[PDB]
From a paper:
We trapped the human α3 Na+/K+-ATPase in its Na+-occluded state using a buffer containing Na+ and ADP in conjunction of AlF4−, and its K+-occluded state using K+ and MgF42− (see Methods for more details). As anticipated, in the presence of Na+ and ADP in conjunction of AlF4−, the human α3 Na+/K+-ATPase is trapped in the Na+-occluded state (E1•P-ADP). The single-particle cryo-EM analysis yielded 3.7-Å-resolution Na+-occluded and 4.1-Å-resolution K+-occluded maps. The transmembrane helices M1–M6 adopt a typical occluded conformation as seen in the pig ortholog. Despite the strong densities of all the helices in the TMDs, except Q920, other highly conserved cation-binding residues, including E324 (M4), N773 and E776 (M5), D801 and D805 (M6) are poorly resolved in the occluded-state cryo-EM maps due to radiation damage. Nevertheless, we can model the binding cavity and bound cations reliably using the coordinates from the previously determined occluded structures of the pig Na+/K+-ATPase. In the Na+-occluded state, F90 and L93 are localized in close proximity to T286 (M3) (10.2 and 9.9 Å Cα–Cα distances, respectively), closing the Na+ entry pathway from the cytoplasm. While F90 residues acts at the first gating latch that regulates Na+ access into the transmembrane region between M1 and M3 helices, L93 situates right next to the Na+ binding sites, serving as a second gating latch and supporting the M3 helix in the Na+-occluded state. Superposition of the cytoplasmic domains in the E1•ATP and E1•P-ADP states by the P domain showed that a helix formed by residues 708-717 of the P domain rotates about ~14o closer to the N domain in the E1•P-ADP compared to that in E1•ATP state. This rotation creates a hydrogen bond between residue N710 and the gamma phosphate group of the ATP molecule which may facilitate the autophosphorylation reaction of the human α3.
P2-type ATPase sodium-potassium pumps (Na+/K+-ATPases) are ion-transporting enzymes that use ATP to transport Na+ and K+ on opposite sides of the lipid bilayer against their electrochemical gradients to maintain ion concentration gradients across the membranes in all animal cells. By utilizing energy from the hydrolysis of a single ATP, the Na+/K+-ATPase pumps three Na+ ions out and two K+ ions into the cell in each transport cycle. In this work, we focused on structural and functional characterization of the human α3 Na+/K+-ATPase that comprises α3, β1 and FXYD6. Here, we determined the cryo-EM structures of the human Na+/K+-ATPase in five intermediate states during its transport cycle, including the cytoplasmic side-open (E1), AMPPCP-bound cytoplasmic side-open (E1•ATP), ADP-AlF4− trapped Na+-occluded (E1•P-ADP), BeF3− trapped exoplasmic side-open (E2P) and MgF42− trapped K+-occluded (E2•Pi) states.
Residue numbers in the entry:
A (entry chain B): 19 to 303
B (entry chain A): 33 to 260, 271 to 1013
C (entry chain G): 28 to 58
The structure:
């Protein structure tokens, strides 16, 4: 067995190997930290060196749903609390009081316009100005009157949001003659977005779809892009698009895919959430 | 065939029971019966070594992993559509690795077994069959039934024998009755059963003592026999058991942790397989096989038989070598040079024309001495040798009697006719324990038909037995001055380093010994006392050419050399001085007494290093005294030792924990070979029993082969140690990434697929490649390893592999992972605690240090790029790990890059690393993504760091031997 | 820039590099 109290615990003066290991690990940590700092010197702070892995950003939705489905019953206010709570928690930062004037935000165009250039990525200027986005443009979707965002009488009203990419200026599709499917009131400065059923039985029977965008055109106005960074543009309000299904069936899972067409928007079969997203929606009774 | 008389047994076969068999009948009967080869197994284990090697070893685990991956892909296919395989590729690559390893191991094993088969047929057995009344060295595979066969003490009996004449013959069966006790033989039947009667000797039963002559009864498979670990291996087995236990513990713990984290059942089981396969050194068995084949090739390069290839490691770890005097250290081809009779030293007139007339050839004393020398010898010439010079004539029998017979033939006349003139009536064969050989002969002259008892052997025993000495034909008692003069002559002869015998005889009286007397070989009714002394016969014993250089090299390797022999202390001391056992300037107790003219008892036994301890004194010594002798003295030379005393000396040397190797040729060294850790027997001059019992046979009979054997053994140990040190480094940089993933909640830095790829690309080919590495310059200058302390795997080696090099490799991989993540957009500051959101399949808004938001698959692509970068970085640091593992104590600059297979393995692992990432379509197969060229240099600083660190450590090792660095960081 | 640069050519260049290393490794032992 392990002998003790006659010569020492498998050794004499134990504070020799331990000291050597302490110095060795200390110097190893020191050179590791030095290498990390040397590497951090090379990487720019205002922009990343590599962005090909943030290939055209994917659309997402405020009602972040864990099992890619939306299910509830209007008869139970609780059944949709998990959705409206998450919606309002994210939308609270868009309240008019939060977005104030005086060199933190700025008043910004009520009509879609060209992407505003805010200088170079260099720090020659201070923190850049930010366009302001109002819940009034969300129309009936925003809880200006009832803090329900639907889910009470009508079927859910999801909201579409495009992921931020540093210094990325989307361009609306050119050659609007065909654009595969036709669009109503084609115009630049808007990134068109369309929600439609995936399967043939889903392409119809979904009912009418009302886009509560900005400037009576379903899409993302370009006046907000490009995003310039968390350090350069703190408290940045990306454009939002609200979609409400006024009339449609009940007690049936309807699969809807919300695409966004553009020349700088790509598509991947591996990533189902890049440039589009699928939703399964059904209301119980 | 036991009850019948010799006449019946020799007339049943139509053979001459007195003379033998001529070549006429021998060829035809050989045709009828064929060669007497005991039946081997039907053909061999065929095609089953291949399957056993690809099924057994440390592979069964890999086979389990492969089949588990295959069924994981099956269950993934048998459920909801999951087109991403990620498992069939793993199964195919695992099976391919297993098959390639098995095929390579089988090819190497066949390469070694071919050499082993070439060796076992290289040295055949032989027997002194009698044909046309003559004995020739005929192969034992030729001897037919019916021919007369003679069996000598210390040889293997060729086939079943019907004894017709025995002289103290004793047979060691050890294989038919289970009684290892030698059994006395006799021509007369004693028991009805043939398994116990003392007149039949069985097949494959060596005759330890005495000589006998008989007629074969059964040869071949129709014969009585025809019907009825090593420390390196145990160390390897213990290490394998311990490493497998550690691996299973780590794999189980990781599997439970994965289940708590809830990857999936399939991901968790695949992670278990990856960890368990990665944590075991599966390349050990192939490396050991490669080392064994290289050892076999190197041994065949200089004709050295090895029974078990793993005994070379024991030979490498030896610390004491016990050597015989004649037949091993000397060429065992002696010739008579000096005599001594009538109180005078006579030089041998070894000339046909007697040029010189040094000594009279007609004196009565010389006549008696010549009669004694020619009559007591058992040596016999060869057939058709009458046309050859006496010196060049071939002689059968031991070297001493051969040289004596040659000298008698050259000087006196015809030995054979002289023997046939004086009828021989009794024989007591020579014995190592007796050290004297006797025979009784009749006298040709009828004037006084008095029986002549002729003795020869060790001079001290002869003097003890004899009482008178022949002086110029007279007969006078042994006076004190006569004894002192004989002594002085003996020391003078020994000072020349020549073997000296003692000759004496005695005329038996007629009134008490009649003509028709009956002697016995077991009941000593002779008057073996108060005999008459005649004279001595010195013989030139030349040491082999390679012996001094071999001894010098072996002693320089920290191996003590002890020369244990049965000869006299003066001759043993002279031979040891000539061959270098006692280096010039080293001085014994008797030499101190002689130089200072002081009694030996007054001499302190501390100023003397060498010792020439007698043999009869060893009977009075105890174990503590023997240990004191072995400790206090550095160059010990035992002398006048019986085989039992040789075994006692070997066991005493063993009692210090020191590995001892014994080399010998005669039957007297058989017990020492049977007891020593490794026994060496000489090929041409060795006896059959010694070479049967030894673990190593020197076919070409050179003593320098032992030095190269120790060289190869130490090389085998060092190559295995280097391979273990290299393959054990990669364990940490694979368990560590998961540990930091689970501790700091950072994204996973190393996946299971990358772990398996790292194992099969870095711990597979370079591991075997390190076995091909040559020997350094300190292999023959370092002290022999301590088996109890310097194990194959120890605490220092584990520390070096895990806490010093594994840590550096893990840090390099982590630096690569962090630089990848920071370049893509995730700074190291905001990575801790992000695993909960990073792994979530529904959070596609994950922010980073710059504000841009990633989808799930977009960030998973970056994580898999980090995995590939980690794999490449581990390959890059494994470059330097392999380079530093090439040499143990010397610098890689001094050692040199002379190993082709090592650069081969480096280039192949780098090519695998490049192809596994940049091959198109590999992003979905093994989830490996291309990495930018600037990312190939992340681990370069760490590779330079580890190379510099080990070079500095080895420099400290070389410049400060025995320091704390050697104590705690030298594996 | 979003547009990929260092691929469809990193694949070709890396395959060329790996083939060169493979040839050099497999040719050294023979010579
Ligand atoms: N063939 C022999 N016939 C008679 N006496 C012998 C013979 N061989 C050796 N002797 C004596 O026996 C002594 C010891 O011989 P032994 O112990 O059998 O082996 P070794 O001589 O090789 O040490 C020697 O000193 C030698 O003088
Ligand atoms: F000197 Al030996 F067997 F040859 F004891």
């Amino acid at each position: 067995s392990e002998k003790k109290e006659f010569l020492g615990r498998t050794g004499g003066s134990w504070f020799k190997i331990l000291l050597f290991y302490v110095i060795f690990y200390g110097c190893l940590a020191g050179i590791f930290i030095g290498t990390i700092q040397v590497m951090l010197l090379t990487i720019s702070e205002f922009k990343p060196t590599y962005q090909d892995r943030v290939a055209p950003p994917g659309l997402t939705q405020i009602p972040q749903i864990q099992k890619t489905e939306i299910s509830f019953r209007p008869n139970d206010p609780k059944s949709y609390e998990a959705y409206v709570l998450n919606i309002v928690r994210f939308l609270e930062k868009y309240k008019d009081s939060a977005q104030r004037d005086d060199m933190i935000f700025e008043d910004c165009g009520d009509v879609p316009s060209e992407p505003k250039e805010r200088g170079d990525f260099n720090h020659e200027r201070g923190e850049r100005k930010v366009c302001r986005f109002k819940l009034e443009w969300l129309g009936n979707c925003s809880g200006l009157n009832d803090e329900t965002y639907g889910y009470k009488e009508g079927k859910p009203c999801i909201i579409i949001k495009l992921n931020r990419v540093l210094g990325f200026k989307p361009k609306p599709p050119k050659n609007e003659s065909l654009e595969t499917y036709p669009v109503m009131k084609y115009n630049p400065n808007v990134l068109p977005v369309q929600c439609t059923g995936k399967r043939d039985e889903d392409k119809d029977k979904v009912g009418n779809v009302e886009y509560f965008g900005l400037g009576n055109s379903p899409g993302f106005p370009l006046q907000y892009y490009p995003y310039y960074g968390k350090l350069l543009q703190p408290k940045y309000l990306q454009p939002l698009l609200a979609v409400q299904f006024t009339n449609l069936t009940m007690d049936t899972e309807i699969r809807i895919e919300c695409k966004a067409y553009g020349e700088n928007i790509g598509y991947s079969e591996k990533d189902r959430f890049q440039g589009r997203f699928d939703v399964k929606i059904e209301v119980k009774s | 065939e036991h009850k019948m008389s010799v006449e019946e047994v020799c007339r049943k076969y139509n053979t001459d029971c007195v003379q033998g068999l001529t070549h006429s009948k021998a060829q035809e009967i050989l045709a009828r019966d064929g060669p007497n080869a005991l039946t081997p197994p039907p053909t061999t284990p065929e095609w089953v070594k291949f399957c056993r090697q690809l099924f057994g070893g440390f592979s069964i685990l890999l086979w389990i992993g492969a089949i588990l991956c295959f069924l994981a892909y099956g269950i993934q296919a048998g459920t909801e559509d999951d087109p991403s395989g990620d498992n069939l590729y793993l199964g195919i690559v695992l099976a391919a690795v297993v098959i390639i390893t098995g095929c390579f191991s089988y090819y190497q094993e066949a390469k070694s077994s071919k050499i082993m088969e070439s060796f076992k047929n290289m040295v055949p057995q032989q027997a002194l069959v009698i044909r046309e009344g003559e004995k020739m060295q005929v192969n034992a595979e030729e001897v037919v039934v019916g021919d007369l066969v003679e069996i000598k003490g210390g040889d293997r009996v060729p086939a079943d024998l019907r004894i017709i004449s025995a002289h103290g013959c004793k047979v060691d069966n050890s294989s038919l009755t289970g009684e290892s006790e030698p059994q006395t033989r006799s021509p007369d039947c004693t028991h009805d059963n043939p398994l116990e009667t003392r007149n039949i000797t069985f097949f494959s039963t060596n005759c330890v003592e005495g000589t006998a002559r008989g007629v074969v009864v059964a040869t071949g498979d129709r014969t009585v026999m025809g019907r009825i670990k090593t420390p390196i291996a145990i160390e390897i087995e213990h290490f394998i058991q311990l490493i497998t236990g550690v691996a299973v513990f780590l794999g189980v713990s990781f599997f439970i942790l994965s289940l708590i984290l809830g990857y999936t059942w399939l991901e968790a089981v695949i992670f278990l397989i990856g960890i368990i396969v990665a944590n075991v050194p599966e390349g050990l068995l192939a490396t050991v096989t490669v080392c064994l084949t290289l050892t076999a090739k190197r041994m065949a390069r200089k004709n050295c038989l090895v029974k078990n290839l793993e005994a070379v490691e024991t030979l490498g770890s030896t610390s004491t070598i016990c050597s015989d005097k004649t037949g091993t250290l000397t060429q065992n081809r002696m010739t008579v040079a000096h005599m001594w009779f009538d109180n005078q030293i006579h030089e041998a007139d070894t000339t046909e024309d007697q040029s010189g007339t040094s000594f009279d050839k007609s004196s009565h004393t010389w006549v008696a001495l010549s009669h004694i020398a020619g009559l007591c010898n058992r040596a016999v010439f060869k057939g058709g040798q009458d046309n050859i010079p006496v010196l060049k004539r071939d002689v059968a029998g031991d070297a001493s009697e051969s040289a004596l017979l040659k000298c008698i033939e050259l000087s006196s006349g015809s030995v054979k006719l002289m023997r046939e003139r004086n009828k021989k009536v009794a024989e007591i064969p020579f014995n190592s324990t007796n050290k004297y050989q006797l025979s009784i002969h009749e006298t040709e002259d009828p004037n006084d038909n008095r029986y002549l008892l002729v003795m020869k052997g060790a001079p001290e025993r002869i003097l003890d037995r004899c009482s008178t000495i022949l002086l110029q034909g007279k007969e006078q008692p042994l006076d004190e001055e006569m004894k002192e003069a004989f002594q002085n002559a003996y020391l003078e002869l020994g000072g020349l380093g020549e073997r000296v015998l003692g000759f004496c005889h005695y005329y038996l009286p007629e009134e008490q010994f009649p003509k028709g007397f009956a002697f016995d070989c077991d009941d000593v009714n002779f008057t073996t006392d108060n005999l008459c002394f005649v004279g001595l016969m010195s013989m030139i014993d030349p040491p082999r050419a390679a012996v001094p250089d071999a001894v010098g090299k072996c002693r320089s390797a920290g191996i003590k050399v002890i020369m244990v022999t049965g000869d006299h202390p003066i001759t043993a001391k002279a031979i040891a001085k000539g061959v270098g056992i006692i280096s010039e300037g080293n001085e014994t107790v008797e030499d101190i007494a002689a130089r200072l003219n002081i009694p030996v008892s007054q001499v302190n036994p501390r100023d003397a290093k060498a010792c020439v301890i007698h043999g009869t004194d060893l009977k009075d010594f105890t174990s503590e005294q023997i240990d004191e002798i072995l400790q206090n003295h550095t160059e010990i030379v035992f002398a006048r030792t019986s085989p039992q005393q040789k075994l006692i000396i070997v066991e005493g040397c063993q009692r210090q924990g020191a590995i001892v190797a014994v080399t010998g040729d005669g039957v007297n060294d058989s017990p020492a070979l049977k007891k020593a850790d490794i026994g060496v027997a000489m090929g041409i001059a060795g006896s059959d029993v010694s070479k049967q019992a030894a673990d190593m046979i020197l076919l070409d009979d050179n003593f320098a082969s032992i030095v190269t054997g120790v060289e190869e053994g130490r090389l085998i140990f060092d190559n295995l140690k280097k391979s273990i040190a290299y393959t054990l480094t990669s364990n940490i940089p694979e368990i560590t990434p998961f540990l930091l993933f689970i501790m700091a909640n950072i994204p996973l830095p190393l996946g299971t697929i990358t772990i398996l790829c790292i194992d099969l690309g870095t711990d597979m080919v370079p591991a075997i490649s390190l076995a091909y590495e040559a020997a350094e310059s300190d292999i023959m200058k370092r002290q022999p390893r301590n088996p109890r302390t310097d194990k194959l795997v120890n605490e220092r080696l584990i520390s070096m592999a895990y806490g010093q090099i594994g840590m550096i490799q893990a840090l390099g991989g982590f630096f690569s992972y962090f630089v990848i993540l920071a370049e893509n957009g995730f700074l190291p500051g905001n990575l801790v605690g992000i695993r909960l959101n990073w792994d979530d399949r529904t959070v596609n808004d994950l922010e980073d240090s710059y504000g841009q938001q990633w989808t799930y698959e977009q960030r998973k692509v970056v994580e898999f790029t980090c995995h590939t970068a980690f794999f490449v970085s581990i390959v890059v640091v494994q470059w330097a790990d392999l380079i530093i593992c090439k040499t143990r104590r010397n610098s890689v600059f001094q050692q040199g890059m002379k190993n082709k297979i090592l650069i081969f393995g480096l280039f192949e692992e780098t090519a695998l690393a490049a192809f596994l990432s940049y091959c198109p379509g590999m992003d979905v197969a093994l989830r490996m993504y291309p990495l930018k060229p600037s990312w190939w240099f992340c681990a370069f600083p760490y590779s330079f760091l580890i190379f510099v660190y080990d070079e500095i450590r080895k420099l400290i090792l070389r410049r400060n031997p025995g320091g704390w660095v050697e104590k705690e960081t030298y594996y | 820039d979003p547009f990929h640069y260092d691929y469809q050519t990193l694949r070709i260049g890396g395959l060329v590099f790996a083939v060169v290393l493979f040839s050099v490794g497999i040719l050294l032992i023979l010579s």
